[PDB]
Amino acid sequence: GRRELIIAESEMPALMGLRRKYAGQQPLKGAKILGCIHMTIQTGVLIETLVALGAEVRWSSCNIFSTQDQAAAAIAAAGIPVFAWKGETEEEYEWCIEQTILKDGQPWDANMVLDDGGDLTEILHKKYPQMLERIHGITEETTTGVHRLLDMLKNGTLKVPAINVNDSVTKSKNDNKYGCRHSLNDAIKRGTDHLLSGKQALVIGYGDVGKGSSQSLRQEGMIVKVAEVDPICAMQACMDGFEVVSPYKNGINDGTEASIDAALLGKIDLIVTTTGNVNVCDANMLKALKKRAVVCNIGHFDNEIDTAFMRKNWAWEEVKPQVHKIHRTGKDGFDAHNDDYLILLAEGRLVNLGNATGHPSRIMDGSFANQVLAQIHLFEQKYADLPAAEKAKRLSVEVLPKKLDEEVALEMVKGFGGVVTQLTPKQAEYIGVSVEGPFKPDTYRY
Amino acid sequence: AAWGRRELIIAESEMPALMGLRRKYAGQQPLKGAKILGCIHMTIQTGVLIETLVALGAEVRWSSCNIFSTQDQAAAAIAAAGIPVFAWKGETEEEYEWCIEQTILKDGQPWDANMVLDDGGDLTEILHKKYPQMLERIHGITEETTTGVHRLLDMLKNGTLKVPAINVNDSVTKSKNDNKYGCRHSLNDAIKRGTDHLLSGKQALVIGYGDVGKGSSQSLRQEGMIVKVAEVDPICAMQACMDGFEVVSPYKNGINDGTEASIDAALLGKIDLIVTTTGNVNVCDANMLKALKKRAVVCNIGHFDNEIDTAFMRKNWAWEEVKPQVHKIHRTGKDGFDAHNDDYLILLAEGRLVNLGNATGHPSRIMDGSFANQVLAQIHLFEQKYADLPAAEKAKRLSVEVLPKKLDEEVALEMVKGFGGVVTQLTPKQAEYIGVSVEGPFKPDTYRY
Amino acid sequence: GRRELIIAESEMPALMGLRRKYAGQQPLKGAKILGCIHMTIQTGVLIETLVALGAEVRWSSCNIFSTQDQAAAAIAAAGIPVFAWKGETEEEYEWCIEQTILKDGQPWDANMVLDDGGDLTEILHKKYPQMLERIHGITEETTTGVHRLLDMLKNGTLKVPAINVNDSVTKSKNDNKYGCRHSLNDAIKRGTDHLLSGKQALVIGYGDVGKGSSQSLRQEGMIVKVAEVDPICAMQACMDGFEVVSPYKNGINDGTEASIDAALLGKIDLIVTTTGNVNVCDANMLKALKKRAVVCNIGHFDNEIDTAFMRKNWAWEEVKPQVHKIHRTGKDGFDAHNDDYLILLAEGRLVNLGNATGHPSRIMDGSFANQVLAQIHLFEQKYADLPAAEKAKRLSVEVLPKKLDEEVALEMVKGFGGVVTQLTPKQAEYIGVSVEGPFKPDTYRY
Amino acid sequence: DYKVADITLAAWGRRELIIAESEMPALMGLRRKYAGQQPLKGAKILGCIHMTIQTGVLIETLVALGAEVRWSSCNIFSTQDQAAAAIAAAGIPVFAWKGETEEEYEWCIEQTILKDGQPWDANMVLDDGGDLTEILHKKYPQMLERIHGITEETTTGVHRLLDMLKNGTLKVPAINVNDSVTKSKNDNKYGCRHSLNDAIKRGTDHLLSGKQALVIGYGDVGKGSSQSLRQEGMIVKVAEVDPICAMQACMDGFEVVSPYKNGINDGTEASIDAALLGKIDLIVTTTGNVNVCDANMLKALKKRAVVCNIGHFDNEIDTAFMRKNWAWEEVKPQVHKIHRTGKDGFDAHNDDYLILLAEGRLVNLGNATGHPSRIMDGSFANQVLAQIHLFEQKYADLPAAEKAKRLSVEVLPKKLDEEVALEMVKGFGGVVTQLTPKQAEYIGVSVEGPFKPDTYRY
Numbered sequence A, C: 001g002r003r004e005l006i007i008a009e010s011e012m013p014a015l016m017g018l019r020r021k022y023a024g025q026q027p028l029k030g031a032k033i034l035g036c037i038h039m040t041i042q043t044g045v046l047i048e049t050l051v052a053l054g055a056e057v058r059w060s061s062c063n064i065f066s067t068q069d070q071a072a073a074a075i076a077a078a079g080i081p082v083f084a085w086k087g088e089t090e091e092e093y094e095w096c097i098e099q100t101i102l103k104d105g106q107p108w109d110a111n112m113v114l115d116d117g118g119d120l121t122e123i124l125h126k127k128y129p130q131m132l133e134r135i136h137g138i139t140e141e142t143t144t145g146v147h148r149l150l151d152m153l154k155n156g157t158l159k160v161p162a163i164n165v166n167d168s169v170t171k172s173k174n175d176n177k178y179g180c181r182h183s184l185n186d187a188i189k190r191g192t193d194h195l196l197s198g199k200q201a202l203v204i205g206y207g208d209v210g211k212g213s214s215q216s217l218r219q220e221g222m223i224v225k226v227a228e229v230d231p232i233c234a235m236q237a238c239m240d241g242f243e244v245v246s247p248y249k250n251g252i253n254d255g256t257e258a259s260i261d262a263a264l265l266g267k268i269d270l271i272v273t274t275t276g277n278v279n280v281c282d283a284n285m286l287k288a289l290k291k292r293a294v295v296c297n298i299g300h301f302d303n304e305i306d307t308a309f310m311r312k313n314w315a316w317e318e319v320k321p322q323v324h325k326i327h328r329t330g331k332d333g334f335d336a337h338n339d340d341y342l343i344l345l346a347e348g349r350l351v352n353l354g355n356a357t358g359h360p361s362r363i364m365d366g367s368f369a370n371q372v373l374a375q376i377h378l379f380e381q382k383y384a385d386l387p388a389a390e391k392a393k394r395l396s397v398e399v400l401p402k403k404l405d406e407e408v409a410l411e412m413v414k415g416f417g418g419v420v421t422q423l424t425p426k427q428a429e430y431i432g433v434s435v436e437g438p439f440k441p442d443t444y445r446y
Numbered sequence B: 001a002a003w004g005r006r007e008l009i010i011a012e013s014e015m016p017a018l019m020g021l022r023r024k025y026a027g028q029q030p031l032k033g034a035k036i037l038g039c040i041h042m043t044i045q046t047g048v049l050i051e052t053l054v055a056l057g058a059e060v061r062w063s064s065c066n067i068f069s070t071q072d073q074a075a076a077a078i079a080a081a082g083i084p085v086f087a088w089k090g091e092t093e094e095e096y097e098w099c100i101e102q103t104i105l106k107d108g109q110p111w112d113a114n115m116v117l118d119d120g121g122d123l124t125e126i127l128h129k130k131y132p133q134m135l136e137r138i139h140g141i142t143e144e145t146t147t148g149v150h151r152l153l154d155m156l157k158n159g160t161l162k163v164p165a166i167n168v169n170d171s172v173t174k175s176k177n178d179n180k181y182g183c184r185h186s187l188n189d190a191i192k193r194g195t196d197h198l199l200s201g202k203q204a205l206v207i208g209y210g211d212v213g214k215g216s217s218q219s220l221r222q223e224g225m226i227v228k229v230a231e232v233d234p235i236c237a238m239q240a241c242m243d244g245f246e247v248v249s250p251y252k253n254g255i256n257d258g259t260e261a262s263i264d265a266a267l268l269g270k271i272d273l274i275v276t277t278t279g280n281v282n283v284c285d286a287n288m289l290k291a292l293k294k295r296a297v298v299c300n301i302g303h304f305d306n307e308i309d310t311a312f313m314r315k316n317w318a319w320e321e322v323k324p325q326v327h328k329i330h331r332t333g334k335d336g337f338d339a340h341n342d343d344y345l346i347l348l349a350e351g352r353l354v355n356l357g358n359a360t361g362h363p364s365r366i367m368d369g370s371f372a373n374q375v376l377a378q379i380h381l382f383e384q385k386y387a388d389l390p391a392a393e394k395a396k397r398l399s400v401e402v403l404p405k406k407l408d409e410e411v412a413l414e415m416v417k418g419f420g421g422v423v424t425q426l427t428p429k430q431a432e433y434i435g436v437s438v439e440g441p442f443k444p445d446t447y448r449y
Numbered sequence D: 001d002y003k004v005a006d007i008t009l010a011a012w013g014r015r016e017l018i019i020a021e022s023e024m025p026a027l028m029g030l031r032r033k034y035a036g037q038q039p040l041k042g043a044k045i046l047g048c049i050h051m052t053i054q055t056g057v058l059i060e061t062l063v064a065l066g067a068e069v070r071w072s073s074c075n076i077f078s079t080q081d082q083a084a085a086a087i088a089a090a091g092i093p094v095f096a097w098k099g100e101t102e103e104e105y106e107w108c109i110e111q112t113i114l115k116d117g118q119p120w121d122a123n124m125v126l127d128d129g130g131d132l133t134e135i136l137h138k139k140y141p142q143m144l145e146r147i148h149g150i151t152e153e154t155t156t157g158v159h160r161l162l163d164m165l166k167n168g169t170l171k172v173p174a175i176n177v178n179d180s181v182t183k184s185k186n187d188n189k190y191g192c193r194h195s196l197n198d199a200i201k202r203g204t205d206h207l208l209s210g211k212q213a214l215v216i217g218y219g220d221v222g223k224g225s226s227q228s229l230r231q232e233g234m235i236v237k238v239a240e241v242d243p244i245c246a247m248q249a250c251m252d253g254f255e256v257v258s259p260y261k262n263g264i265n266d267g268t269e270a271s272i273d274a275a276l277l278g279k280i281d282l283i284v285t286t287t288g289n290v291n292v293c294d295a296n297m298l299k300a301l302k303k304r305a306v307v308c309n310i311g312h313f314d315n316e317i318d319t320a321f322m323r324k325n326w327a328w329e330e331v332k333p334q335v336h337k338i339h340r341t342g343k344d345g346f347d348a349h350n351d352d353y354l355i356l357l358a359e360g361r362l363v364n365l366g367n368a369t370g371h372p373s374r375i376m377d378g379s380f381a382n383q384v385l386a387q388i389h390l391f392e393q394k395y396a397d398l399p400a401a402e403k404a405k406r407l408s409v410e411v412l413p414k415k416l417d418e419e420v421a422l423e424m425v426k427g428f429g430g431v432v433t434q435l436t437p438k439q440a441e442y443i444g445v446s447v448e449g450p451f452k453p454d455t456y457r458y
């Protein structure tokens, strides 16, 4: 049961540090919890203090197939039931349309889900539209960058305060700037099982994925050229170590093959696309390559590279999983070995989905920590139980403050082994910042 | 005189951004008829700046800002040209404000001037304090000091402000170029020109991991050093761990109380040189100096001399000078010292900035992008045509703003072409899909580069 | 088997370049060569490139474990039958010597010979020494067999010139610097399989593989420490930006528990051993290490770390296949999770059992190319025409000359795409080097 | 006896010398061991090497250890002003100052040989570059009778010395300390990696990041130079004639190009590939050969490119052709501006001009102070250890029949190199493990004896 929890357990320093620091004066003495987000093995630890919550949970699982079959074997503590369901082999409407939203979510407060998408937002809260001014549970902390703001809340009558836990500082930095940097190091590693020293490769774009994918190749010992459409990112490319060139001739792509430089195209064998555009490598640069090229699409979505033209004119023969031998000028012959063929370094889509199945749980350590801690930036005052005159004074939608991320980062800093200095009272007022923080405004970029 | 132009002409070729403005808008001259009063320090680079400004049809008058910062021989060229300059140091320092007063006031009647290009000056102590009503003709003010914009915003909230102004210190092309890069280029040169030490195999202490901090860390590691990072912000200190550095503090359990028992003597006994990259006071007190390894080097790239302690040293430890970059300070006392003794310290400068005290700093190309945004501000202000708008709208537009992102990218475009690179141009079909026009900025305002 | 040949022939630029270059000259017109090396894939292409120049080549079996059954599919195309063995079939070795040397009941002559193991050379004089005074030379690839060859040369016995293909500047650089820097990354990926940027590791030994091992870890964001007994290697470590530490106080290993610096060993999260020595990591220093530390060995012998002490005095467990959990409680007695335990990676042994894929097939190319030039150089001289008096000078063993190494490296530079400048006559006499001969003396260390 | 512009300049040298000694442990450490013995009493060394502040401590330890030496500069722009005055203030007769002409260079090399108009008797020679060895080997073949030792420093000099032996004109045994590991892989590998980028920036102040450079030659100097340029953000290219060095250049992550198409140089304009040379802003020469940058390549380069040289001699780049065909103008000391429009017709606003560094001489000595102190530690120690070993033999007094075996070039054994390496590592703060008695029976060597065979190249 808990042996699965022991596998990570302390592997998530932030949440465990919160447990070992908030084991005294226990907050969140009110509502129960249900939970709906996907029940991975890692996820079912966000309860933190189960005694301060429902302790039955049952993991309502409002979104699609959130629960997992490991639930029956793992969640077996005292008084906490679980359904242990996966997939849709049976009817899902009986437990989704006729969900425990009314059964477990009884209209006498003492119930939370802390889920993604806010169940049904306006219609959800308007079934029992009396919780306003009586905040004793969930207050729309749903992450869900797709949900973003949902203006319907603002222009509508639903004025319950909400502070979504996405779009923080440590969430994005841990994913793109550092941490999950194994994006390119899943092909350029054993995936091509080749040495990259001395070769020349082309990477298009210089965004966060582009910035993270250009230091690894150079540290390997490769020669890299960067393309960009935005002057700021191109300048950043020039200033670090890289020359900025464009596939198209003279800086203008207008009509045909006469508007591409055929010199640099015929001497590069690896293409990495760190862009989310439509035609960043159309059927015009693949016509000029060094008789052998490997293409991996690291960018978002799958609309990049070619279009439904490369599939027919060039045969996508497969000789190895996630690897192909797309020909260029191998007319007839039935061999395509006279240096006229191209390797597909991926299947044509994101490597994290095709070439990879499992993902580390370290990326969500800073995601769950602030999401749990936001309830105490909430709760606490609970200005809902106040006259409505003061209610409209502070009604707005804000992202999570700076302190709620600095405290999360502090646990990760000392997890590896390290000490952060404490500001003396004299130094705090000289700058204009309290001793406990926060130290920087919202316009700082780090 | 003629020598100054010879110095100028060679350095002129290293600034694609300023020179490209003279021919990108060749013949259009959007800055026709604009009169500008400025007080930026007289340097070779600012000479290129003013020469670029004049080439667009406008005329400017410049003076000194700090008096002490001057090039002497560079003023001969401007004097021969005709624009009055008071870069020469005053014998009794009474010329600090007397010279600035002379440029502003002409004859005995007001004269038409619409723009001001100041550098952190005290014009508010002259213009906004002695004759605020004169602002009926000036349309905008350009400032670059990072602390100036906050003062301007506070004044706007107080309502005493009369004419809107725009700050440029919040631009990406300024913050990224002038802080992260440059210090990476200049830190190694500053260290080696005074010490000539083999940085490989040494151990260094860096206090702070901010804008200058990242460049300082990357500058010492590329030479083959061992670097440790001390930080008070967990978010900034987190970035040190993922950059390969280890986070330590000079105090036991991060608690400081003024007693000698709160200093970690094991860590401080292995460091070779120490730098300070913050803006606070006493980030390295006299207690850290006691535990430092003998024959250490002290550096400062912050703002003032109060970041690392020097008043204690001048009252308790000896001093000795050879060249005005490196000083000898003995860890025994002020009574005396021996020429052969080991108990001494090496201090880079007297605790002030080391980039100015060792070299020219960002020599010619990084400073190019800093000076290009200031000129592009004047064109935008003069295009607004404040005179044509009625007096009713004057109270509506009184606000403090920053350069729009569209004007910022053009400064960066010229820098790329200076390295011989080429920037791709979006097709009309591809631009509309991503949600940005072909020319308009491609990212929102809240993006973190 | 044809597919394996195509990839192997395309991954060996040196031999293929020699085959496509020296064709048309045929420097093996009058050579009678019989060869036997350890049976590998590259041995086939070595035979092919030897016979492409006109040499009369005969192949046999001289090693027992090197033979593989899967090679029979590839030899089926060839008209020459081969023999393979599974294990130590020493009793069958007499059959191989008799049948392969004696073709049709009559003695046979070979102008030059090239074998492996450095043991078959004595057989030539033992069985049929009559024609062994008419052999131009011998080239054998073996370790420590050159010692036996020089011993017999001082003792007389076999009268034939010799030259080895093991000592070369080209062979060292490809493998020691860029061939051994492959297992460490793979080993740590298999073991930890997570980001390790900011932690601390200790690497033992900085002779030749320590440099690659220590350079690979730093670019991943680790603090690397190096311990060494050779002062010159320590000096090279210091100049590269590392730190030199000693597990024992002042470096003196007194054998007691009071002479170990536990302060440093209490902050180390990984132990890497590279040196081929005994008791470089004793059980006393393995008891002062921090919890959850990981030990690994990439050296030569399996008895570098003080192993079997944890086997007897402590307990073991089973984890991910090449991961072992060793508990510091002692013999027996532990709770469900506890905190005192270490982790092994290969119990001090090699990773060839299946832990890592190992070095790629390109390793054998760097050494097999030199053998062709060794044969060609030791064939131009007229052994039958030289008098006995001058044969005293020719009766010597020398390493491969400097000229033959440069021809090997020239092909590698063109493979990646490059051009080598050619000297003018005026400059060549200023250095003292012919425009087509060795460029560096024998005392140049590169 | 001295000749300096001002005696006040010696104060800077000693303060740097004390700092130098504090950061030069091995030379000072071995000084104390032999101070009470004086094993080289009666030695006579005539020295000609770059008089840097690193170099002065060697003269100081030789003179305070019981020997008499005379020293002179090695190049026009070689001697630091403060280092020369410090040695001069100690009483040793030296000839060095600021500003020297080519005709004045030959006056100083022969001044050390002579003594007040009469020849000076000597026993050992410490020569850098082979200039002092050859100048007396032919003009005054008499001094070789008493002189019985020569110690060389650079790679080029040992080639000139070795050529003498084959011709039979060499008469004095020599010690080749340039082959020791603590000099070949320490002095001229890392010294350039620290000094080249300092010398480039101090003259031109260019922002190296994003620019392109070309480096000729990938020997020991080439590796350090390439790393120095690469760590600052440049995009560097390497040209080489030796295939092994080219292989090493490609493996590290550089690119190999040849200024002459297909590598064939024949003097015509069709040999030069103008396209590749049109995107280079910096060219550095490391080979040490003659005429590596010709007229067909120097005038066909991209506008406003920087030329500098680290080789020992000035024949790397053809400065003779451009001297009398193109006008030369000075922008600052040790840096020149050359307009290639015509012989004498140029204006200040011309767009076509090249910038020359150190006039083709050694750039790291002209526009920079040179190698640091801790890099030069591993060379002077071997020099001292070789001088003591050979002086005691007194080859000038050996029997004639024995001279047939004692007239050759020798090298120091590996134990001395190990001792120097240990004494230099101990000053960085490191601890070297000491082998237990059980270790010797497995490694194959004793506790204190050597650790590697002679075929080992590190």
Ligand SMILES: NC(=O)c1ccc[n+]([C@@H]2O[C@H](COP(=O)([O-])OP(=O)(O)OC[C@H]3O[C@@H](n4cnc5c(N)ncnc54)[C@H](O)[C@@H]3O)[C@@H](O)[C@H]2O)c1
Binding pocket: A175, A176, A183, A204, A205, A206, A207, A208, A209, A210, A227, A228, A229, A230, A233, A274, A275, A276, A277, A278, A279, A280, A299, A300, B424, B430, B442
């Ligand atoms: N690593 C991950 O897990 C992950 C997840 C989602 C998205 N991403 C990617 O991370 C990146 C970071 O975003 P960002 O805002 O820094 O960059 P971006 O989204 O704007 O990516 C494109 C980059 O290339 C440039 N570019 C745009 N269109 C181009 C075109 N047609 N041709 C060439 N260059 C073009 C842009 O200026 C930008 O620098 C995005 O590209 C996004 O797709 C990564």
Ligand SMILES: NC(=O)c1ccc[n+]([C@@H]2O[C@H](COP(=O)([O-])OP(=O)(O)OC[C@H]3O[C@@H](n4cnc5c(N)ncnc54)[C@H](O)[C@@H]3O)[C@@H](O)[C@H]2O)c1
Binding pocket: A421, A427, A439, B178, B179, B183, B207, B208, B209, B210, B211, B212, B213, B230, B231, B232, B233, B236, B277, B278, B279, B280, B282, B283, B301, B302, B303, B353, B354, B355
């Ligand atoms: N000399 C130069 O070339 C140069 C260039 C730019 C800016 N500056 C000046 O120097 C300073 C550097 O600016 P910046 O961009 O680095 O600022 P920043 O705000 O980006 O960073 C300063 C850092 O100091 C840290 N800090 C403050 N007190 C601390 C303490 N006691 N211990 C540890 N860390 C502490 C903060 O957490 C912050 O991360 C500013 O005053 C700036 O005006 C100098």
Ligand SMILES: NC(=O)c1ccc[n+]([C@@H]2O[C@H](COP(=O)([O-])OP(=O)(O)OC[C@H]3O[C@@H](n4cnc5c(N)ncnc54)[C@H](O)[C@@H]3O)[C@@H](O)[C@H]2O)c1
Binding pocket: C180, C204, C205, C206, C207, C208, C209, C210, C227, C228, C229, C230, C233, C274, C275, C276, C277, C280, C298, C299, C300, D433, D439, D451
């Ligand atoms: N891929 C591989 O695993 C591989 C490849 C080649 C060789 N090897 C084997 O590796 C072994 C080691 O040789 P190498 O190739 O690594 O190079 P190497 O022989 O140059 O390295 C040995 C180093 O260990 C140091 N050393 C010896 N005893 C020590 C001690 N007690 N404490 C600290 N340092 C000590 C020596 O000073 C030397 O620097 C050889 O026996 C060789 O067979 C392994």
Ligand SMILES: NC(=O)c1ccc[n+]([C@@H]2O[C@H](COP(=O)([O-])OP(=O)(O)OC[C@H]3O[C@@H](n4cnc5c(N)ncnc54)[C@H](O)[C@@H]3O)[C@@H](O)[C@H]2O)c1
Binding pocket: C421, C423, C427, C439, D154, D155, D156, D157, D188, D191, D216, D217, D218, D219, D220, D221, D222, D239, D240, D241, D242, D245, D286, D287, D288, D289, D292, D310, D311, D312, D313, D362, D364
């Ligand atoms: N601080 C200094 O300035 C300093 C220090 C040490 C050595 N040096 C000088 O450096 C020079 C060589 O140093 P090294 O020991 O590295 O020499 P090296 O012999 O080890 O290598 C020099 C390289 O030049 C190459 N080369 C020669 N002619 C060539 C040609 N025509 N085209 C291309 N490459 C060519 C050779 O292949 C060789 O690899 C010597 O002249 C020596 O005096 C100067």
Ligand SMILES: Nc1ncnc2c1ncn2[C@@H]1O[C@H](CO)[C@@H](O)[C@H]1O
Binding pocket: D049, D050, D051, D052, D054, D055, D128, D153, D154, D155, D187, D188, D191, D312, D362, D369, D370, D371, D372, D376
């Ligand atoms: N600072 C220095 N002092 C003396 N000789 C040096 C110095 N730096 C380099 N050299 C030597 O100069 C010679 C060629 O310039 C080489 O032998 C090199 O080792």
